[model samples]
Target: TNLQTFELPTEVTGCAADISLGRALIQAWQKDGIFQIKTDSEQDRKTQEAMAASKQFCKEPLTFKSSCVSDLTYSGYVASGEEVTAGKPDFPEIFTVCKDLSVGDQRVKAGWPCHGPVPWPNNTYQKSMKTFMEELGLAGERLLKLTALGFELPINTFTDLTRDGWHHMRVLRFPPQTSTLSRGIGAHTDYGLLVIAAQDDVGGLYIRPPVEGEKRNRNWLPGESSAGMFEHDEPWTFVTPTPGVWTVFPGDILQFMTGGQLLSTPHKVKLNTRERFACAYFHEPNFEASAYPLFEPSANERIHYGEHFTNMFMRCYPDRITTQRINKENRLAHLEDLK
Candidate 1:
């Protein structure tokens, strides 16, 4: 029998599943890919150092100089938007391992090499991650079709948009902390179209409702609120993880695609005593695709997805060090073109 559906606050939805494939995948990855890797690998050493630096930076005043350097190939650290938006207290420490599983032709053009000692062990790790990504991609496609049906659109409406999409999987590990007040990750929304997360039993995910007395944007049409709505000014609520269930949510891109019809809920991870591991699969349209409003095509201007992605990444990591690195790389690329 299929799992029953339940409504969660903050525009989040949950569904129960009897199948244990997701659990088995997670267990294998954690044991063989994460834990079984050679501790002496250079990639692992860098990842550990980066994580340590991130932790040390948390103790000091948040500043550009204190920001940790992230290696794009392996795992890296990401500071919260709080640091960029207001120099407010930094969010919890986060380390992310990213694997690009875009189509082979597209990946080759994107110049992302999967071969060699990039991070994980050679054969086994690559094979396992590939399998995990395949499963998640198929699931994402099925959800997109369902979403299209819910909107009375063609079942292939959204699925077609992702034909040459850029699909990637990330594994995030939140370290255990003794401080009860510690935050695992600060409040923010995801950037892509959709996110499907498989979380462990150690739960700490929380969602914050919109501000009190805040009205919908003037652009929102009448009756849109009831279609896909979340409460306002509600207190933070935790999402308890079921053993084999996957948490699904729409992201900023989807909200834009729907002309703001869908809400991208603000969520964060609270401090926890036990370590938490989460595998998040992100589904995004091709770099050349435009995020045009599907229902109200004339109501919104189309934006190039690639440009939007670059702008978001820039704003999210605005420390001077990161800015300098970006500029230096840009300059080098320009000089190469001149040559």
Candidate 2:
């Protein structure tokens, strides 16, 4: 398998051509990192206006007048003398930071926040991702035959690499904030197998470790040290994500599905001074494929393809578009093709 790159021969301009911008973008990325201007300056502005007008035609207008305002408050009780340390808040987007990565195209830049979704022009060096997947199906068929003949082997053993699978892609844009911790998004763990991400050149991605505090025991004296006592030797750690490179991590669902065969790494993004913009892609197995591993030869060890896949989808993206939802009324439209 090999990575494939498709390039457009020429640039096309016009208000109507916006729908084919993907092809134009790929073409520009392959060129000297520059996009040929298709529309004149005035046309571009008018195009923007037209799009805005279209959106306005569909939804109700929004306003922040007093008529739209509502207020609510709650009471909290504090003991005679008690103090609390302020909690850390979430970070906005990290778009700027992603742009500064030393790799990838440097010449042609897009006005958009992040270029992770834009493939480099002429730079065709990626895994034959789709081909590798098709080969995996063939391997699965072979493994099934072997199992029936009393031969034993792991499902992933036929492949060159470990059973460790990968995927996840995202685009994040954190708006400006007035407060230090008024972040665009809160810190959380990914619930997938693996994630690949790209961000804008400006920096502002922060990773912080859990905080620790000293424990006080009224029954113990200062002269005695306990084995379980808190120590200041370990300091909180943080990770600053770099731009241009792909970031991969095993997520929560993968850990459970793999039965500890793969590990889910914990990470969080901290909001800081700069706005953040990023795009990420997640890689996973075919949704209809069984999640059960071929490590054991017992019926109890088998996993249901539909059930596990549905669970993962629900866990990662609760409000997502499903196949059934996309074609609810056309369930029997292709039944004859099955014959």
Candidate 3:
């Protein structure tokens, strides 16, 4: 079984409340922790336009794209080596937009890490992305409602947890890879509550799905099972680029909420010989919310959502001046000061 690499079941649409499908979806998520979802036709169309705008923006002069890069975060153009994953610079130039809060709002004025005005390329990118993010955002909510039911909780249990939440999107452009680094993005787990992503067919994305088997599914820590299940040689499951599908990735906070029984599996992007474009939307909790595990955890590692999210900037966006300054100050400042 050490040679195993898994493929996901065909994707499911989230808008329907069919109990049977919801149950199956939860089972699939628990086993693999990553799967493709079929968005509604409305979202499908928006994705088309979103990609068109993204591709158009990608061809603009680097000077313009760089002009969009925000001083606070990687919320605009991310030059090929400006962002890193697993300590290595990635090969993709990214267009990132964290949820924008108005400067009149308290969060934006206080230098909140992810809240600021987006550097729109033009009205076309603005309108399409707003529409696309809105529609796809609903798709994520629909899935969560179904998942709450599948777990036998109150129907709105999960949805209500993020009432005051905000989200961000990254439209990535990975140029053809023939250089020293074959990886466009190295292996990493997303830090948010959920991730909704769409990608083109030039495929190179992969995930390390959880190990199979019932006992392993229920209690996966090494101490819980002496099987050494994680000792396999870099088991990676190739994510097939099915047309019109969105991949829903449960993130670290979601895993922590469930007491770490389920997972936010690590994933990576190996560059294709041709170009690739993809959009990943991260759905998160309210910036100041205190996240608690539903089930008792093994350790007393309590974390505030905003603190964890903001601290990550020092590593992921190290090339940015703000992030660099944070790193420098962190040498003397306590972790609380940085957050």
Candidate 4:
């Protein structure tokens, strides 16, 4: 498998890398076998519960939180395109599995209710997912090294910062759109360092290049209450996924790390009539790591990753604002200290 380069603005550095192992792992986990298992069994029941919880969470405002599953976090959003006045309208249901790179334990059991300790349908699914995530994580690391070299920094520049990172893999499912105007996910920039995704062949992924000479006033700042920061008034290019090829993108965190030298490309999904499934592996720094620009000589402010993520969550899910006031306040204080 050979890596294919994507032609885009210099600001957004991205490419599709060929990861043979990644594709094999994905091929092994058939959708019907993993996602469509019988719902009557105990293991299947837990899977259904998680899905139900995710659906319910998406219905609420930004500040919404699950009372029962406090530890497990889910996000649901409907992309109306009214904000950017572009792209189709759509909704995305997301399930998150957190993995601490510093720790060896890969099993996730406590967040959502499950028959056994692990949330997977069976041990096979669990083993496959664990292996898949590990492979994806390594691929992300390789991209990061290349990204560092692109910036004229040491290859290890970004890799060293992520030693104790809080990486996560997202299981995303987009329901079929009945209307032609349905958008599976709205145009927005990703929040992490880099994203490596293995998407099903249903298509619909599109990336919007940054307009020439158009100043993107979108500051990748945490807790900022502004919408449309990542939106752009530009045409979108459709990205067709190739089997075994990993689609990679530099996210907002990478932008912050580079002092805005690198771009966080705005992308979205438009599902027509067929359902879509994609597994996105997000590579982030340690929860406590600071978002200080590495090569840029001007940026002195350090943004805490944990706080930035929290603020972003509150911004996207404002319904949880009041509930997360204390944490938000503490994050603000920390930001003030950094300033």
Candidate 5:
């Protein structure tokens, strides 16, 4: 099957005239679950700089890279087994950078897990990653407006929730496949709203959208349930990488708002002999926003961003879980096996 792609139109500001086209795009996204977007000149330049910086980061000495670890889950430098997916260890070196919440920020004052210092290698790497993620975050905003128009909702329906959101990026280098490190990343969905990833030519991403009437659940862990709806077998299909194009996929929050009709797709990465590098940006809603569904008789219960994020953080990195609690309903309270 041909991968769905969209040409970045001259100006995609939504209007009544663009309503029909928006619905068509929505249909395309629903069917494919993942797609690629053609980047403009400026976006292309930023992506080039970002990818180059990521490669340099990968070449850095392992002792230096591993020195910049984070206290929270999926925050700073993540060594191979430090991060897991579907209860299995991932075999890639990752540097996850977020907004510079160094100190004095209210989020940090409240002990927000992922809002701490990011040990950037240097200013070049920091600036390059921030600029690229900011540019992609703008595109994510545009996509939400398009979604609102297609659903006949308010023009500001989704944008209002993501104002000054917690957007972040991860630059990963997956070593060449070995007998023990067969999987680069396990099958799973993202925790945020949207993912726009720039992957190099090694090409190893695979995806398998849920079947008809099957919905993806939030269950993740070794002791927890197995991989959601998508089968654990070789049901996964490869997602080809095209130069200058970024892969796009929605996350669970978008799925909740859509009444589970268009939830996030489950995708994994399998490295070949050649080492692979990928740069991904996550566009998320504000920490305080509520992921209330679109239906009146809600198909899913209301969930808060602060609650869901911490809960999943503990599940994936349970040993790294902090003593600080964010909500009363601690679904993962029993997961305190200190690292």
Candidate 6:
């Protein structure tokens, strides 16, 4: 059913009923490759820039040396049973980050903005998202046509339980200190399926491209001499994401969504002497159905409709899984190789 237009508060924009339906259609198009979504149009770019500027106006620039939201202090992220280890733990103590997203308790002490477990289709941030999608070349009319071409709706009813959600924005104001590996968030991938991140002009993102030097170990001994040469590679230049352009990257669940076609992007936030503020929207699936691909999907496919995305996300990020407690062994194992 085509939904008629309706007005809604800006915050409640994307989560509106009709808009959600449109998102469902878009998902169907992506699954079957039956239709394509477009890039942002010129108007959309202008609107997005305005929105970014407006957000910037309200936010005070935070730096690494500045005091961060006091409440973000790290407590024991220690999972049950095991005590803390000596080496830098693979995961950080993330309770402060987790508590902010609990249902009905969206506010965090950090004063940053975040939307936990909320479906992207239904969130107000998505209100103009359709325009963004069109600009990306994802046309709704094309999606409708694809729906007619035998894409199946994954839902039993029109009511949507799934929504794309995000973590609250952060202004990590650290005290002035020499930059080192131990300081900020260590290397890790985001916990959800997709992440749309925007950074303040204070850039702190880094990537490890393949090293370029050559080495000849005993495996490649030269001449009659048993000696081998060792070489080290120089660091090459990598481009940081441009400001104002939302850096959209893949997460673990995206692979599942596409039946393993798309993979996750690995990135890290480097801690430095300067303060850093970042805005990231954690885009996730709205439901908790299996990752199994639907066969002969409907044109308006939405197999996991009404399923709670938080539940699915929790399976991946068990420390914050508000639902059932996944076994630590199973959780840790899956984290090692999330497909």
Of the candidates shown, which would achieve the greatest TM-score relative to the real structure? Answer: 5
Q: What would the TM-score be for candidate 3 when compared with the true structure?
A: 0.81
> For each candidate, how many residue pairs have backbone atoms clashing (under 3 Å)?
0, 33, 0, 14, 0, 48
lDDT of 3: 0.69
Among the numbered candidates, top lDDT falls to 5
Q: Candidate 2 residues 215-286, lDDT tens each?
A: 322111124312122222332123334322323333444444434433343344444465554444344443
RMSD of 5: 4.7
Q: What lDDT is reached at residue 246 by model 5?
A: 81
TM-score of each: 0.61, 0.38, 0.81, 0.64, 0.86, 0.39
lDDT of 1 by residue, 292-313 (tens): 7888856757655545554445
Which 10-residue span in candidate 1 carries the lowest summed lDDT?
30-39
Runs in model 3 with CA error above 4 Å?
1-20, 72-74, 212-234, 297-300, 319-321, 324-339
**lDDT for residue 186 in candidate 3, whole number 0-100:** 72
TM-score of 4: 0.64
Task: Encode model 3's per-residue lDDT on 1-339: one tens digit a residue.
Answer: 112122222332443444456676667776666777766677689988898899999999998888886554446777888776545677898888777556677655556555567778888898999899887667767776666666666666667766767678889988998887677887666777888888887888777777655233222222332222332346677787777678886777777777766577667788898999898898777666656766675556555766666666654666676575556544314335544
Candidate 6 per-residue C-alpha lDDT over 1-339 given as tens digits, one digit per residue, 9 for 90 to 100: 111121212222232453465455444323321111222346336345434532442243333212222222111122212212222332221212222243445232222222233222123333343333323222212222222222234332111211222222221222223544433443334445444444556556543222224221121112311111111222212224343344444444443344433334334444545544444444333323333343325434333311323333343334432222233223323222322
Clashing pairs in 1: none
lDDT, model 6, position 200: 50
Ranking by lDDT: 5, 3, 4, 1, 6, 2
**Local distance difference test scores for all models:** 0.49, 0.30, 0.69, 0.52, 0.72, 0.32
Model 2 has an lDDT value of: 0.30
Residue-level lDDT tens digits of model 4 in 1-339 = 122433212122333332332232222221110111111233233333433444444455544322212222322122222122123333655545554222123322311110012233334444555656665566567556656655456657777878867677766667788776565666667778877665666777776554556554335663541234444454566667553355666677876776655566667777757766666778988756677778767867776776666565555544432325435434345434533
The TM-score, computed over Cα atoms with residue i paired to residue i, of candidate 2 is 0.38
Off by over 4 Å in 1: 1-124, 208-233, 318-326, 329-339
